[model samples]
Target: RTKKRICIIGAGPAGLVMAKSLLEEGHEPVIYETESVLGGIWNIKADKTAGVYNSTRFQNSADTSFFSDFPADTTDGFFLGVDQVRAYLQAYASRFDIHQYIHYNSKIIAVTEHGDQWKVDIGEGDQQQTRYFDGVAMCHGRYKHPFIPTIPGLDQFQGEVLHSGQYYDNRIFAGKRVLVIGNGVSGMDIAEEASHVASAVFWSMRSLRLVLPRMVGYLPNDFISPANLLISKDNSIIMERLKNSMPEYYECYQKSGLFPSLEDFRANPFVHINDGVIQRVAEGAIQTHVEDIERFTGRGCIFSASGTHIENIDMVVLCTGYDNSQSFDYVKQFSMRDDFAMGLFYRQNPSLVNTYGLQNVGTTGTLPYLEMVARWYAQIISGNYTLDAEELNHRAGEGEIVVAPLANVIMGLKLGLLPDPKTEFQAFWRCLNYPSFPPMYRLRGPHADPQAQSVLSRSVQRSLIGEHDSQLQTVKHRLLAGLGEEVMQALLARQEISQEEYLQAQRCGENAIVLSWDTQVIRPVKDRLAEEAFQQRITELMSQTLKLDVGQITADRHLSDYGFSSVTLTAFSRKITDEYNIRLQPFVFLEYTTLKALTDFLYRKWSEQQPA
Candidate 1:
């Protein structure tokens, strides 16, 4: 269980996180980079990089893509360009002295299992050398081998054609009639860019996708994923709120024929993040067609189904995405399971015990997920957590998930690698409200960041209403507050956790830790005078919110008796959360319909929150 030597391939974000995790666990990590730089795909200037376009920015926001301990220093908005992203990675590398572990211009050609260790081959021609390590981390990224589908008569066409991978600048599209193929994130981005300079822009897609804005209304959509909105037990109200907040998008989405089917959305709610594509399509700047290219003509291509031929097409940009068909030939050539145990390791080989294969190239939350997968490896190597391969293999074979923030989090908590406030009720409530930033994972666990709380506060203050704001921000702020309250209520109802000091805990900072299941002091909350006043305060709130007289809000009467429907109850829940700074769930009004019940419960909660 002592320090083990680990070999890390690629010096990008994933490799960097893995190095830090290993270093923290006292394991020595040596990183191999074929290029001279640290950032793999982000450093577009590097020769071996995935080579991004001139105008590329993060599809997801910096919050979801940054390291848990290090927030991006130069993120001006949700999306950041190459310079800022690479700068952030470089700063992180410097902060942790990661350069010491990185070997520039050293390519790992092959890796094989050697008894209990891993044999790594590096270098070129005769200069190639062999090295062995206790464990291997193949994080060279999964964006290699771009997939370019064959269009008949493509070779004879008298126009410029390029894969999205080879595309680097919009300058080429100047005055050209461009046909952008595929409708994934890159496809949309390219089409949007071409719209600015190209004479005409046409988007060809195979299927409809639900593209949610990076900022749904004013809140970063990351907040919704991290919140309890996606959880099976408590979700209805959050969806209603999200839908209500942006009703216009729903109508426009249908018009564009890009809205996901309701059945699919309900069965598995997922969305692609694209802030401007829908707007562009709605404005008629670009045209979208749901058909395939049958064959290319000397002038242009004919649509497969309609047989319509559009002539004078000067260029075709294919954003058909990447080919992930290759196996890890270096280490036994096993294909990655989508549910790959903890989203990383292989269960088939006993020698590949500590190996972690990170593949987040085609999805969202790339960096943060990479950091988490890296951290999980550290725990496994340090003997803190066990790798249950067989169970995960069965689970992986069953099906694949598009993305799962809640599942990843609960896994971490269950393994004690993430903060589990089950026994510590004081911190539970506040943590429930913390934004779903990358730093949230570092709150309290294997590699907790001391400045995480302040950093998170800074994010909320700067991004939300703490500065100049809008009504959209209020909903975002109110929703987070509401989620915290509701989540606590869920756990409390399940008897999974108790909230004796919940109100008193409100006085504590979100990062504050208190309470012990085995041994803890319970300061009783029996302030009769305060309780009496809180009762009237709640009654007064109901009076103002419902536009009813104080006498009408009777203690024994159900809130429904006073014209409180699910809709109005949602609005009032927000009001109460704002007034008392108490977190709440959406269905809370349905739970305690009586004024006395709400007042008594709220008063008890508020009083307990008070420090003795």
Candidate 2:
């Protein structure tokens, strides 16, 4: 293969995806992974990674978050635990056979430009190795560094304090009072999880985040990226829809001054998703305090704005995201930023590229967007990609981010990337209404796969023609189609085109979209096996996790009753949850104490989630 030799650092999602893209472009990718395990941070046991906590679920639904080529079979519903997420990534690497190129347990020391090639320094001490490659892909991901917000007298608080990173198990939180700070997803997730076990949960959000449910009825929230397709500048249509749908939560929006002039809504509409937290907030199980903490007394924190104080805070979990400077600390000399319109790369060698990490993953799901980016990078290597010269010349400062509006902007610039249906055409209704998985992009792109149609329609059947068919159909129609009419109004107000021209524009088939119920367009990965098969999995997991014989795992006995508590039972429970591909609340031993109860509960829940 007449391919350029490229050095990709870190065997994370970005690294693995880049390696696959390089291979697709006929390029030789030499990946250096610090840890022996792959999937980067999603590998919960990996040291020095920041993504997964003990109970971390992929923030975005697995149905929409995976790589374009590989569809995650969601027989267990949309969300996946960190272990399952790791398994998905491992499957991706295995499917593409990207393992041979990866060098595990290797650390990248430095990288420098070397005439036409790039010099990469890897390893350390006596085991040091040097390599030269035509280019480098800095897939060393971000969010590795956590930030602890400084509140006056926070150190004086008698409560145990930690970032979301140190959170491992729910047992430690039992009967304790928890105070969760931050408007991010982790803050919401930790608050929700803590609520189940803790005596009292207090959530502190400094700003108002439009909390969205992971699922709207049977449809995943991101099934329609109306924000991406929103034509209005102020984006009041979606705001209006939000007010109508979530009127109860609108008080926080009104109070934060984010209501009238929603400038922040332009780039990132700070969205925090949790189905549990919203309903919990409604039920008054968790207290939602919208004031910044002024100071912390020995037992609790006082809100400066409202002058309200809460006492008896046992644990403070800061979900206040990562510090970018820490992630950027590795390469200081390169300084400032040099991303070409979110096509993440510096001006070293044209092929010396990076993406999805620093240039911002935006405020949406990461993997599908990264898959689209990987293709763009592949094109760069093949000399097939194009860019506006002026756009490339424009340099970005240290922490600038790209707006989703421009994601649509650039996505529009590249005509071939998206199927044309005002969004994506032939699969018009499905594309507009469905989760635009990786398959949607591959239909007729640079590395177009012939099997994409089957993969796509097969996955589509999970939503369309699956369940609550007409209800889901009506709901999505109301969202995207109603949102579309608003766009037409915005277009008309601009005076760019005549009413006849606007009507002509409306004549495009985008005006009429129908999600067909005709064939079951979707299918699962492996589908389901017999009850005995799952029962066999339960025994196998308990035996391996409990370190006992399969027959010795008493189905009717409690895990602790069989000589194990939280320490050993947690691992056993994790093994059962992972191996069986299900998500239940933590402190699992409390809910299903007996082996048979746990087994029966899992078998029933997991079996119920399987397609008919």
- Which segments of model 2 are wrong by more than 4 Å? 46-49, 225-228, 233-268, 336-343, 357-364, 394-415, 419-435, 459-612
Best candidate according to lDDT: 1
- lDDT for residue 339 in candidate 2, whole number 0-100: 39
Give the TM-scores of the predictions, in the order they appear.
0.70, 0.68
Residue 223 lDDT (model 1): 55
Q: Write the per-residue lDDT of candidate 1 for residues 1-612, one digit (tens) a residue.
A: 567988888898889988998899899988999889898777665233246777777766666667778888653776788788888889999999999989999988888777878889998778699999888887777666788788898889898887887777789799999999997778988898888889999877754555777666666665544334323222344445457777777556544434443433444444566767877775668876655677899869776533446689999887988774542555445555542453456554322432223322222466776676688777777777665644355323212342435434544454454444544433443444445466666677677889987877766564443111232233233333333656555646766443543443333335332221101111111167656766776776566556588877788998777986443454455444433435465555667768887876665554454311
lDDT of candidates 1 onward, in order: 0.63, 0.62
Q: For residue 177, give model 1's deviation from the true position in Å.
A: 1.7
Return the clash pairs for model 1, or none.
Answer: 485-583, 485-584, 503-609, 504-608, 504-609
Error of 2 at 507 (Å): 14
Q: For model 2, what is the error of residue 323's alpha carbon versus the real structure, in angstroms, after optimal superposition? A: 0.9
The residue-by-residue lDDT of candidate 2 on 61-82, one tens digit each, is: 6656777678886766578877
How well does model 1 score by local distance difference test?
A: 0.63
